[PDB]
Scaffold this active site. Structure first.
Site, PDB file in Angstrom:
ATOM      1  N   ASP A  91       0.846  -1.220   0.000  1.00  0.00           N
ATOM      2  CA  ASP A  91       0.000   0.000   0.000  1.00  0.00           C
ATOM      3  C   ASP A  91       0.874   1.260   0.000  1.00  0.00           C
ATOM      4  O   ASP A  91       0.322   2.334   0.203  1.00  0.00           O
ATOM      5  CB  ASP A  91      -0.911  -0.008   1.227  1.00  0.00           C
ATOM      6  CG  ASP A  91      -0.153  -0.234   2.528  1.00  0.00           C
ATOM      7  OD1 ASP A  91       1.098  -0.197   2.492  1.00  0.00           O
ATOM      8  OD2 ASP A  91      -0.813  -0.467   3.565  1.00  0.00           O
ATOM      9  N   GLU A 113       0.524  -8.894  -2.590  1.00  0.00           N
ATOM     10  CA  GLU A 113      -0.354  -8.601  -1.424  1.00  0.00           C
ATOM     11  C   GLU A 113      -1.477  -7.662  -1.866  1.00  0.00           C
ATOM     12  O   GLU A 113      -1.532  -6.536  -1.373  1.00  0.00           O
ATOM     13  CB  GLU A 113       0.468  -8.055  -0.255  1.00  0.00           C
ATOM     14  CG  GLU A 113      -0.279  -8.063   1.067  1.00  0.00           C
ATOM     15  CD  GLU A 113       0.372  -7.227   2.151  1.00  0.00           C
ATOM     16  OE1 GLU A 113       0.233  -5.981   2.102  1.00  0.00           O
ATOM     17  OE2 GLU A 113       1.045  -7.816   3.017  1.00  0.00           O
ATOM     18  N   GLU A 127      -2.656   5.060   2.295  1.00  0.00           N
ATOM     19  CA  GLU A 127      -2.521   3.597   2.029  1.00  0.00           C
ATOM     20  C   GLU A 127      -3.749   3.063   1.278  1.00  0.00           C
ATOM     21  O   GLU A 127      -3.575   2.315   0.320  1.00  0.00           O
ATOM     22  CB  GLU A 127      -2.301   2.821   3.327  1.00  0.00           C
ATOM     23  CG  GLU A 127      -0.864   2.858   3.825  1.00  0.00           C
ATOM     24  CD  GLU A 127      -0.421   4.124   4.531  1.00  0.00           C
ATOM     25  OE1 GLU A 127      -1.307   4.972   4.817  1.00  0.00           O
ATOM     26  OE2 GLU A 127       0.785   4.202   4.897  1.00  0.00           O
ATOM     27  N   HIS A 194       3.670   1.908  15.363  1.00  0.00           N
ATOM     28  CA  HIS A 194       4.394   2.768  14.393  1.00  0.00           C
ATOM     29  C   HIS A 194       3.451   3.628  13.551  1.00  0.00           C
ATOM     30  O   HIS A 194       3.949   4.590  12.988  1.00  0.00           O
ATOM     31  CB  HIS A 194       5.338   1.918  13.527  1.00  0.00           C
ATOM     32  CG  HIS A 194       4.670   1.182  12.413  1.00  0.00           C
ATOM     33  ND1 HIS A 194       4.190   1.832  11.289  1.00  0.00           N
ATOM     34  CD2 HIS A 194       4.418  -0.131  12.226  1.00  0.00           C
ATOM     35  CE1 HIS A 194       3.676   0.957  10.451  1.00  0.00           C
ATOM     36  NE2 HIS A 194       3.795  -0.248  11.003  1.00  0.00           N
ATOM     37  N   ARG A 196       1.425   6.381  11.812  1.00  0.00           N
ATOM     38  CA  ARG A 196       1.579   7.858  11.936  1.00  0.00           C
ATOM     39  C   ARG A 196       0.348   8.450  12.631  1.00  0.00           C
ATOM     40  O   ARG A 196       0.537   9.307  13.475  1.00  0.00           O
ATOM     41  CB  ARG A 196       1.833   8.521  10.576  1.00  0.00           C
ATOM     42  CG  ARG A 196       3.310   8.808  10.327  1.00  0.00           C
ATOM     43  CD  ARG A 196       3.688   9.324   8.967  1.00  0.00           C
ATOM     44  NE  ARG A 196       5.108   9.036   8.739  1.00  0.00           N
ATOM     45  CZ  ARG A 196       5.597   8.008   8.027  1.00  0.00           C
ATOM     46  NH1 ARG A 196       4.794   7.134   7.437  1.00  0.00           N
ATOM     47  NH2 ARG A 196       6.905   7.851   7.907  1.00  0.00           N
ATOM     48  N   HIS A 227      10.116   1.697  16.580  1.00  0.00           N
ATOM     49  CA  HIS A 227      10.142   2.245  15.198  1.00  0.00           C
ATOM     50  C   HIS A 227      11.196   3.356  15.146  1.00  0.00           C
ATOM     51  O   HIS A 227      11.305   4.163  16.071  1.00  0.00           O
ATOM     52  CB  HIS A 227       8.723   2.676  14.805  1.00  0.00           C
ATOM     53  CG  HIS A 227       8.606   3.211  13.422  1.00  0.00           C
ATOM     54  ND1 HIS A 227       8.458   2.385  12.324  1.00  0.00           N
ATOM     55  CD2 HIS A 227       8.614   4.478  12.960  1.00  0.00           C
ATOM     56  CE1 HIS A 227       8.388   3.130  11.234  1.00  0.00           C
ATOM     57  NE2 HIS A 227       8.458   4.419  11.603  1.00  0.00           N
TER      58      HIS A 227
HETATM   59  O1  LIG Z   1      11.873  -4.724  15.203  1.00  0.00           O
HETATM   60  C1  LIG Z   1      11.239  -5.206  14.230  1.00  0.00           C
HETATM   61  C2  LIG Z   1       9.903  -4.904  14.042  1.00  0.00           C
HETATM   62  C3  LIG Z   1       9.200  -5.422  12.948  1.00  0.00           C
HETATM   63  N1  LIG Z   1       9.823  -6.234  12.076  1.00  0.00           N
HETATM   64  C4  LIG Z   1       9.138  -6.758  10.895  1.00  0.00           C
HETATM   65  O2  LIG Z   1       8.625  -5.595  10.224  1.00  0.00           O
HETATM   66  C5  LIG Z   1       7.504  -5.991   9.428  1.00  0.00           C
HETATM   67  C6  LIG Z   1       6.377  -4.987   9.529  1.00  0.00           C
HETATM   68  O3  LIG Z   1       6.793  -3.872  10.324  1.00  0.00           O
HETATM   69  P1  LIG Z   1       6.199  -2.452   9.906  1.00  0.00           P
HETATM   70  O4  LIG Z   1       6.864  -1.361  10.685  1.00  0.00           O
HETATM   71  O5  LIG Z   1       6.306  -2.558   8.469  1.00  0.00           O
HETATM   72  O6  LIG Z   1       4.607  -2.446   9.875  1.00  0.00           O
HETATM   73  P2  LIG Z   1       3.712  -2.526   8.495  1.00  0.00           P
HETATM   74  O7  LIG Z   1       4.159  -1.462   7.536  1.00  0.00           O
HETATM   75  O8  LIG Z   1       3.788  -3.958   8.002  1.00  0.00           O
HETATM   76  O9  LIG Z   1       2.327  -2.083   8.931  1.00  0.00           O
HETATM   77  C7  LIG Z   1       7.088  -7.384   9.894  1.00  0.00           C
HETATM   78  O10 LIG Z   1       7.447  -8.285   8.866  1.00  0.00           O
HETATM   79  C8  LIG Z   1       7.914  -7.635  11.142  1.00  0.00           C
HETATM   80  O11 LIG Z   1       8.201  -9.030  11.331  1.00  0.00           O
HETATM   81  C9  LIG Z   1      11.175  -6.497  12.293  1.00  0.00           C
HETATM   82  O12 LIG Z   1      11.752  -7.219  11.487  1.00  0.00           O
HETATM   83  N2  LIG Z   1      11.847  -5.990  13.338  1.00  0.00           N
END
Ligand SMILES: O=c1ccn([C@@H]2O[C@H](COP(=O)(O)OP(=O)(O)O)[C@@H](O)[C@H]2O)c(=O)[nH]1
Ligand SMILES: O=c1ccn([C@@H]2O[C@H](COP(=O)(O)OP(=O)(O)O)[C@@H](O)[C@H]2O)c(=O)[nH]1
Ligand SMILES: O=c1ccn([C@@H]2O[C@H](COP(=O)(O)OP(=O)(O)O)[C@@H](O)[C@H]2O)c(=O)[nH]1
Ligand SMILES: O=c1ccn([C@@H]2O[C@H](COP(=O)(O)OP(=O)(O)O)[C@@H](O)[C@H]2O)c(=O)[nH]1
Ligand code: NA
Ligand code: NA
Ligand code: NA
Ligand code: NA
Lengths: 355, 368, 362, 360
Positions: A91, A113, A127, A194, A196, A227
């Site tokens: 997205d 996806e 998104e 995380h 926003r 984050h």
């Molecule tokens: O400390 C971290 C936190 C998250 N993840 C990985 O980050 C991805 C998604 O994190 P994100 O911040 O992207 O959230 P999203 O954008 O998917 O909503 C997932 O695959 C988690 O397994 C990671 O590898 N380390």
């Protein structure tokens, strides 16, 4: 012999993790060559052996300026690298702008996806609009569930253009299967937050909930990988840095992170990826949001909306810690971990065949 | 007192003609203020309808990549939209401007309305980029002014909520009516001299996918018909591209039965269409205008986004096959039964500007 | 009403004078619209009512940089102005680079004043190579003489692409035949008109020609020279430093085309390395002594209207004397019946060629 | 004869209105020449302000804007031979321009100096800008004794502080010399302006809800709401109130039209700093749509009350003032003057003359 040159465009950790299984499959199979172009990571690139051919230095910024630059500048590297087909994931504004750039050069697009919908317009922004725009640009849609495939049909996509491949994040999990000292023989909650739209007050409320739970339950531990944004780090640090029941972390390498999720008793997150990964390890998920594009886990009882209300987070975490019947009600949605392969067969069928 | 500031973004004659009725309505009604921003033949139309652009971005030129043009509109339209305090943006049709402008508006959380929404060929990326632009604008727009029930259906099929679709009809009909009541501004000496008391075919052809050989075939058909039928006349207003002008000029400039023209001011053009016995075109606008003046239309294309005229028998696909064009034009000139079979409203009554205003008022000038 | 949009590209006075008749004819006839794009003049634009649509500010410089800029930048204005056909004139690096730019945009090119050849390769440079390059780019060639038409056929041009139109410089002369101090200076005196500008003659050779003017002046007290100076400070300095004290010589600023043609009419004879003046002076029955070792205008040589004289002072002195003393040699260089370079209707003949080629169907 | 060339730097309507009286005074007096340099036309025309230069800097990241003003304002200040620069208020322009002036050793005076909330980086960046300008300025034109005290507390020498009052009062007096009249004529009219960025979205919605409740409850009550020129601010008010014919939503009003309307209003709801200074001076009670103010003088004197963005409290507080004439007159109490008499431009001139047109 002719390889289908498959462009792989991403800007962020989440995109890279989900695209890595597909890159590896494309690299292994002799019929395809992956060509990575980033808009941004080095940790994840190293872990999965991803080697970018070009890095545009675009993302740091107004959405219009970022989109303008990707639309303006991604054509050249796609043409220079002789790309036949472009894949974008998720997205992100990159996935949209890159898909539009590809379409301008008459490069067919596949969407990894595809079909996740909240059902609430421009919520979140941008998104939700990005998904709907990518959906019209893509020739091929790799849906992770039947629900997602349905959403694509409702927006006018031909059934023959939709493959239910499952989610590559499951493939990625399988490929990676002081923190130990901290968790060893303790009930550990994993929290990531995380989004926003939750920055500031709402994150404060979630940090307050972690504080109340901590004082109420001396044996309870939290691990919170933060984050990488100083405003997100400050709200958690200023609320929790003194409590030795909480371990605030730097972002964890994907292996370390999936290992930790495996040891956790349950998961609090607003992450889309974690909402897909945690249920697959039979960890109940409390979603720190008012909506999700992942209703499958909601419907199956794997996951519950909890928002940013501290009273409800405290109640819901307690329920699961005390009452083992409520806990087991959230364990038994998003694919088997062979999605990369199913994507390859869709690409082969569509662009490596003749009638 | 606070007016709803309605952004009006276009780059081309066709967009301007279709948007003019809406600009005039917005100017007349005290609850709204039109704010025209162009991305661009146009000064003629601006003058005729009294359109006064607030800003002209100098983005569109002949030899530019689609990506560079879109990049510039996405990059640069935000500021003028914010400076002019635009509350809502309207884009028209299938142009890359309408798409890029709509995306730019959405980046600034400026709601978008789409004039002439829901037209579909049914064939993917055919033509490119018009068909993909419509589908992208469709997802960006909060409000869709469909010209027909068929068009409204196409929007529902792409997931648009019924409450966001108004069947307003086509503003091109409004625009026609505004120039038929204006004989002084429509008077053209040489055109009248050439047509007066003669059977005149009107031909316009401009689609990029038809440039070169296919246009040559259509020019050949005009030549065969001309020699076969000494009393027959053609008027051909030429699209302003030197490659289009050269194919027609090199095939027809010596035949005194053919009058090759510069693009005609909209009044002169609609007047000529009124005097024409029939119309050959690949134009979307002309396919809407000609049936409304009871002129049979032969469409110089293999497909149309306007199936209403096909279904009603107002219009027939003819493509770029010279044998079929010759046959089909002959049929209509000789056999008055076939001619009357292509005459009897497919595209609205000419009050679409007003119906658009009531949709805008309802949506963005009301409170719970 | 459909007009053939005719691009007119020039950068210099000589190009503008030769193109002016064609611009005027294109403006008068309703079938055509002239679209002027300059690479540079205001005096000549005003005199003939030329109104440039665009002025690229390219010419002030290495040939490669100038050509690079015209090739790079002329396409856009040609496309924006919806040009159907481009006309370039003569042997200038503008005419070549503009023609190449037009060809890149598939805009057909017509060449005004086509086929003039010295016969000596890269002599002068780059004029001789420019003509041969334009010749391959142009779809249509307006040759000023039968000789010029022959030169085009020898370089592989199809006969149907060559019209012998004559030279538009004659049209331009006639349009200005329709100055206090200059008349005061010439009135009841034998006046020689001298112009010299060719780059390969700068420095020593110009000095030799200025020396010849000095010797003739002292030897012949009644003899007068008017010398309009090419606008370059190195050319002005050689003439000024040799002749500014002699009151028999009037050094001038560049003259407006009208004033200049009037002066040529009053002159007893003409010394020049100018291509234009070699075409204009014979048409007014003035003998021409050509200050060069070669010419692309052999018609005047063959007919006896003009003689090669180079930059040898002894020969210039002898040749000017011969013509001033011996009225038989003088009359041998006047053919006021015969026209070497056209009748003054070349603009019209160009129009009929354009109409025939791009405003007709088979 | 030598004129003190006084640089006048602003980027916004509010700065221009407050600086206009000073520009006019500088133009009138032969000892001074005003040199306007903008970082940003109705206001310029109304007061006869003629900018010598317009940098096209403001449309954007704070760092990029500040970087450009610091980088580029020196040259126009040097070219125009400026001896002294005046900046107004709390804007990032006033700060960056003051720093640019200081780099060229051009002395700075600060118009409207010493206003403090007392809460650090709240709001941001206005509160930090004031404290930075305060250290850069040689001369401080404080509008009140309270403001002068705040400057002393940040280490400013007493001789560098003049209590001149606020030039916004001068500006009001300079403009007090059809559809709006039609709408207000013989009706109790509330004037509402709301623009602060920290209130965009939900909190503005709450204030619009309060206007709706008051409107339905009190059929004779009217509201005039001139909307801040931002499409997000216009949308929240339009979407809540555009159907209620008791509310007249307006485009930004010319300063004259706006002050006239404030004169006819029964009371004023605002988060504006300027309006909090102007309305009390016309004896209109002010309800401040904020949780804090840099203008505590009106609070202390009872001219003005904090109300925030709580709809219940706005409804109660507006009702109190409309029903109970004793509470109404308690917020007009003639006698205390919070923000000056309307002669601040003159008092500024005498401070400039004293400091930079005298010799020991
Ligand atoms: O400390 C971290 C936190 C998250 N993840 C990985 O980050 C991805 C998604 O994190 P994100 O911040 O992207 O959230 P999203 O954008 O998917 O909503 C997932 O695959 C988690 O397994 C990671 O590898 N380390
Ligand atoms: O010489 C002309 C030819 C056409 N039109 C009008 O141009 C519009 C159609 O524009 P075009 O065919 O250029 O584009 P399309 O409408 O095919 O997208 C219609 O309203 C026509 O009546 C015009 O004003 N003058
Ligand atoms: O002072 C002058 C000298 C020459 N000419 C004219 O300039 C043209 C030739 O210029 P030049 O000799 O520089 O060019 P060339 O003919 O050698 O290419 C001819 O038409 C002359 O009539 C002019 O108008 N004024
Ligand atoms: O429509 C309006 C609204 C306000 N003002 C004036 O604008 C100034 C304050 O503007 P704003 O509230 O944006 O600024 P603040 O004072 O909060 O910085 C005051 O002098 C008001 O009189 C105006 O002329 N027209
Ligand atoms: Na491979
Ligand atoms: Na209006
Ligand atoms: Na003409
Ligand atoms: Na003064």
């Amino acid at each position: 012999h002719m390889a289908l040159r498959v462009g792989i465009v991403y800007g962020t950790r989440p995109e890279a993790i989900k695209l890595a299984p597909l890159v590896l499959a494309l690299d292994a199979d002799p019929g395809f060559e992956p060509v990575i172009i980033t808009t941004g990571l080095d940790e994840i690139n190293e872990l999965f052996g991803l080697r970018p051919r070009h890095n545009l230095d675009i993302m740091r910024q107004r959405l219009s300026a970022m989109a303008s630059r990707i639309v303006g500048e991604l054509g050249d590297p796609l043409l220079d690298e002789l790309v036949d087909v472009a894949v974008v994931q998720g997205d992100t504004s990159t996935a949209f702008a890159a898909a539009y750039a590809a379409a301008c050069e008459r490069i067919p697009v596949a969407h990894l996806e595809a079909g996740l919908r909240t059902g609430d317009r421009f919520e979140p922004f941008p998104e939700e609009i990005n998904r709907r725009l990518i959906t019209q640009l893509a020739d091929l849609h790799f849906a992770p569930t039947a629900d997602a495939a349905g959403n694509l049909l409702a927006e006018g996509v031909r059934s023959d253009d939709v493959y239910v491949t499952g989610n590559t994040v499951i493939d990625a999990m399988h490929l990676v299967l002081e923190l130990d000292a901290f968790t060893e023989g303790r009930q550990t909650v994993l929290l990531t937050m995380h989004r926003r739209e939750s920055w500031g007050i709402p994150m404060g409320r979630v940090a307050a909930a972690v504080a109340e739970l901590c004082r109420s339950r001396p044996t309870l531990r939290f691990v919170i990988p933060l984050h990488p944004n100083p405003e997100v780090r400050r709200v958690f640090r200023s609320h929790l840095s003194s409590l030795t029941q909480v371990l605030l972390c730097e972002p964890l390498r994907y292996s370390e992170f999936i290992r930790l999720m495996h040891r956790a008793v349950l998961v609090l997150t607003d992450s889309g990826g974690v909402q897909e990964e945690a249920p697959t390890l039979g960890k109940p998920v409390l979603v720190l949001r008012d909506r999700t594009e992942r209703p499958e886990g909601i419907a199956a009882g794997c996951a519950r909306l909890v928002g940013t209300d501290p009273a409800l987070i405290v109640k819901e975490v307690g329920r699961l810690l005390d009452d083992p019947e409520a806990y087991e009600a959230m364990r038994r949605c998003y694919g088997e971990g062979d999605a990369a392969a199913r994507c390859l067969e869709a690409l082969r069928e569509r662009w490596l065949s003749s009638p």
